[PDB]
Amino acid sequence: IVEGSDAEIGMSPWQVMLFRKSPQELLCGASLISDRWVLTAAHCLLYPPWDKNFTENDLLVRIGKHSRTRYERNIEKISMLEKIYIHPRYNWRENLDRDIALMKLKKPVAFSDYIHPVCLPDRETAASLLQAGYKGRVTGWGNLKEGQPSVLQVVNLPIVERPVCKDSTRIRITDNMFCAGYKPDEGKRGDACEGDSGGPFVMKSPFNNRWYQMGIVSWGEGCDRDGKYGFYTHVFRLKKWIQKVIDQFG
């Protein structure tokens, strides 16, 4: 997160760290949606142009974290992965269209003050909350500049109009993406960055006070650049696939 601030304790209890077994390193953010399932960007697991093709065993998920590097004894839970599922039509060849992946954990993680799942939107919540101007929240332990943070970072950003998103890049934007960020000189800035990927873009419903994951941190041409914006996987547009995988293997 670029230009964000220190997350508060328990502020984002669905924040999941995607962590490589060896060398020990942070890979990406992810988010907790049930006691067995974790959501993340597909490119965190599979990205052939960089020889990235992780197997269940190469990885662990760390849930309930605040500190980036500390083993947070009695606070975090570390889980092994039972199975990885990548969206069958994830377009890594071109533009990361459908940048989404589910991870089934070997055992259920126990909830606590620091570990609690986020809601996924239904058709109504999507329509009602995904509008230009509305702000969502992004969290992660990725780069602070285009070093690394001691603690989970947070930033709130407004959703941007589809044409402005399209006009900011040469990349072909699909209906399974949306962008967020401030425009130049609005007087405010902020963005996700390398390491934040797979993390959640969330919004708090003013109808029921629940947090809903509207986006997954996906890509950007740099971090916090003027006239540029972060792109997020449109979670509701890919809900039939999410429900499908969960109903089939859970």
Partner: peptide
């Protein structure tokens, strides 16, 4: 950088 995690996780 990273603090050693219990070996049971590995």
């Amino acid at each position: 950088d990273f603090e050693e995690i219990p070996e049971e996780y590995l």
